[PDB]
Amino acid sequence: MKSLKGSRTEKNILTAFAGESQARNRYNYFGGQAKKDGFVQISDIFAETADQEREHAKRLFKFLEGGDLEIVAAFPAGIIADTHANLIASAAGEHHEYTEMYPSFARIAREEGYEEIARVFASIAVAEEFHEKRFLDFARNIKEGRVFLREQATKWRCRNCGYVHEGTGAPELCPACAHPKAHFELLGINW
Amino acid sequence: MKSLKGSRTEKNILTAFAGESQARNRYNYFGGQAKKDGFVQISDIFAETADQEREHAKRLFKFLEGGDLEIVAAFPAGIIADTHANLIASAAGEHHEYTEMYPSFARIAREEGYEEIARVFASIAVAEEFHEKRFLDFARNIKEGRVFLREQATKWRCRNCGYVHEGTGAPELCPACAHPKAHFELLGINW
Ligand SMILES: [Fe+3]
Ligand SMILES: [Fe+3]
Ligand SMILES: [Fe+3]
Numbered sequence: 001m002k003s004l005k006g007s008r009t010e011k012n013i014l015t016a017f018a019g020e021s022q023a024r025n026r027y028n029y030f031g032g033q034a035k036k037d038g039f040v041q042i043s044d045i046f047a048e049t050a051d052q053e054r055e056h057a058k059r060l061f062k063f064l065e066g067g068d069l070e071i072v073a074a075f076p077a078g079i080i081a082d083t084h085a086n087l088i089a090s091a092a093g094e095h096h097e098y099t100e101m102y103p104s105f106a107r108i109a110r111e112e113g114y115e116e117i118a119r120v121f122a123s124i125a126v127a128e129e130f131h132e133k134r135f136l137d138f139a140r141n142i143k144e145g146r147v148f149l150r151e152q153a154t155k156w157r158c159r160n161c162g163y164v165h166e167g168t169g170a171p172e173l174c175p176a177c178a179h180p181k182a183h184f185e186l187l188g189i190n191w
Numbered sequence: 192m193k194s195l196k197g198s199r200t201e202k203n204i205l206t207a208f209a210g211e212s213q214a215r216n217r218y219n220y221f222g223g224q225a226k227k228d229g230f231v232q233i234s235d236i237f238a239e240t241a242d243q244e245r246e247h248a249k250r251l252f253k254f255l256e257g258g259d260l261e262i263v264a265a266f267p268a269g270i271i272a273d274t275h276a277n278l279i280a281s282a283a284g285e286h287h288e289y290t291e292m293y294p295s296f297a298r299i300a301r302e303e304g305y306e307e308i309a310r311v312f313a314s315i316a317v318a319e320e321f322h323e324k325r326f327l328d329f330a331r332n333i334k335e336g337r338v339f340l341r342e343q344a345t346k347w348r349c350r351n352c353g354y355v356h357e358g359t360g361a362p363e364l365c366p367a368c369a370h371p372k373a374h375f376e377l378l379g380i381n382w
């Protein structure tokens with residue numbers, strides 16, 4: 001470290017901040033479309049990813065010490081589509097970020113004496129890979145019609161009321177809260 | 192209207208989207224700092240303004256029909272300070288936006304045959320003026336020490352539990368929910 005002011009890293013941070021800020025918005029918009037599309041678990045993961053982008057941007061933004069600063073950079077100009085498409089566009093952009101943008105940025109940060117920032121750019125990359133992974137599995141189940149249907153009987157959980165259900169597919173309506181299949185997910189345990 | 196692709200308006204929308212996306216983040220960060228600073232009513236108004244920026248950005252973003260698109264533009268590189276400073280930086284940026292950026296953008300939109308977009312840029316400007324107004328009155332009370340103290344006895348409301356209190360100043364603790372003065376605001380009626 002030292003001072004960012006005038007460095008290339010300084011513009012890289014702002015550019016990342018600008019792209020991650022926009023990603024938060026798009027993921028929130030993508031989450032609202034997934035809810036409309038009937039994918040509540042996917043809606044909440046967009047919303048979760050949005051929130052996690054907010055936190056990536058926050059860490060970066062706190063690096064800056066400065067005033068206004070001009071950046072040249074390209075950004076998706078649109079667009080909000082169907083959920084599958086939203087998930088793939090999201091995946092693609094996460095992809096460029098972790099395979100391209102952040103590795104470079106990291107490099108230069110490193111290569112300007114900003115190794116902490118360097119670490120942070122690499123660390124966010126990790127998150128972005130998982131984000132990608134996640135978006136892709138979900139796109140694939142949507143593609144393979146396996147969101148609400150699996151080939152062996154398994155357990156599904158109602159996200160709305162916690163009702164658990166044994167079967168190959170989620171129910172068309174929660175016996176407990178009477179919410180529709182959209183609220184069902186594969187029951188998972190991570191503790 | 193017609194098609195945005197290649198227009199100057201197209202880059203203006205993305206640039207606005209990019210600046211408004213960043214504003215959402217900064218206002219959310221500014222809201223978290225106001226909560227820490229002991230200004231809960233001001234925290235929630237940052238959060239409210241953040242949310243309203245999300246909605247300005249959403250309307251704009253929905254205009255785009257496109258792919259990647261390069262923009263040159265300047266953005267605050269930082270910073271998160273004390274609440275007063277956050278409120279003034281916010282005011283300044285809202286100021287530039289409604290007096291400068293959006294009037295121009297509107298003009299060109301107009302002047303490219305995009306009059307609906309034109310209307311939207313002018314309409315957002317209105318919101319941004321109120322946003323400014325709001326931030327400025329709050330900065331002024333913080334400046335004049337009148338956040339939690341007024342010169343005549345008046346009524347204060349606990350934002351946490353609704354408890355209402357008659358006095359020149361808010362109480363140091365809510366008699367009802369036992370939360371601190373930070374949660375108090377001037378009682379208001381807008382219905
Ligand atoms: Fe990500
Ligand atoms: Fe249920
Ligand atoms: Fe505003």
Ligand SMILES: [Fe+3]
Nearest residue numbers: 349352365368
């Ligand atoms: Fe109270």
Ligand SMILES: [Zn+2]
Nearest residue numbers: 020052053056
């Ligand atoms: Zn991110």
Ligand SMILES: [Zn+2]
Nearest residue numbers: 211243244247
């Ligand atoms: Zn706005």
